[PDB]
Amino acid sequence: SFGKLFSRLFAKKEMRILMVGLDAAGKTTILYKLKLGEIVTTIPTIGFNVETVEYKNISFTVWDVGLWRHYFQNTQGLIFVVDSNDRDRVVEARDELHRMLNEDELRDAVLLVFANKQDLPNAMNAAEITDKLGLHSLRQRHWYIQSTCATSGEGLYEGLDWLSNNIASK
Ligand SMILES: Nc1nc2c(ncn2[C@@H]2O[C@H](COP(=O)(O)OP(=O)(O)O)[C@@H](O)[C@H]2O)c(=O)[nH]1
Numbered sequence: 326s327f328g329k330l331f332s333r334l335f336a337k338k339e340m341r342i343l344m345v346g347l348d349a350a351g352k353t354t355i356l357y358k359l360k361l362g363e364i365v366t367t368i369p370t371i372g373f374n375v376e377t378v379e380y381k382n383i384s385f386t387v388w389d390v391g392l393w394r395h396y397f398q399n400t401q402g403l404i405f406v407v408d409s410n411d412r413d414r415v416v417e418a419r420d421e422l423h424r425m426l427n428e429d430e431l432r433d434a435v436l437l438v439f440a441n442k443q444d445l446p447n448a449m450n451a452a453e454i455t456d457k458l459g460l461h462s463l464r465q466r467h468w469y470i471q472s473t474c475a476t477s478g479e480g481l482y483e484g485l486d487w488l489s490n491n492i493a494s495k
């Protein structure tokens with residue numbers, strides 16, 4: 326499944342794909358669903374828990390948003406996970422997304438937004454999320470938004486296919 330997607334990137338030097346988002350967005354769930362290796366938790370500085378899956382030359386690195394700079398230098402992809410059902414935190418998610426995009430060291434990173442929890446009845450759809458995250462206003466960035474249900478895995482392949490293809494082409 327996902328392994329073949331990411332083995333496209335074999336030619337690259339050691340790289341990072343950062344996946345961030347507010348607490349409860351579904352990040353840990355997605356990491357587990359990838360099935361690309363054990364999720365290992367480290368605490369590099371007091372109060373800062375990082376989860377990492379190392380698959381071949383790729384480190385999937387996950388923390389909650391809402392001294393990160395040393396991680397950015399080899400980050401090729403940025404995945405931003407939003408709870409599509411959490412209307413009351415979408416403004417906060419927009420702010421955290423754009424602060425991340427304001428980091429000079431992430432200028433060239435490819436952006437994948439997972440609009441997660443699409444299984445939920447009252448979830449905002451991907452178009453609403455796009456509007457509310459100000460994605461249409463980005464002009465230099467390569468970005469894509471993908472509707473997902475992390476607990477079933479639905480949508481993960483499609484979004485990761487896009488992400489890996491976009492990094493690979495560089
Ligand atoms: N309904 C629904 N629940 C989800 C989905 N993805 C994750 N969750 C749930 O949301 C909660 C938070 O997930 P978690 O992976 O720990 O979020 P994290 O804080 O971003 O690491 C858990 O109860 C998950 O089962 C989804 O697509 N749909």
Ligand SMILES: [Mg+2]
Pocket residue numbers: 352353354
């Ligand atoms: Mg988590």
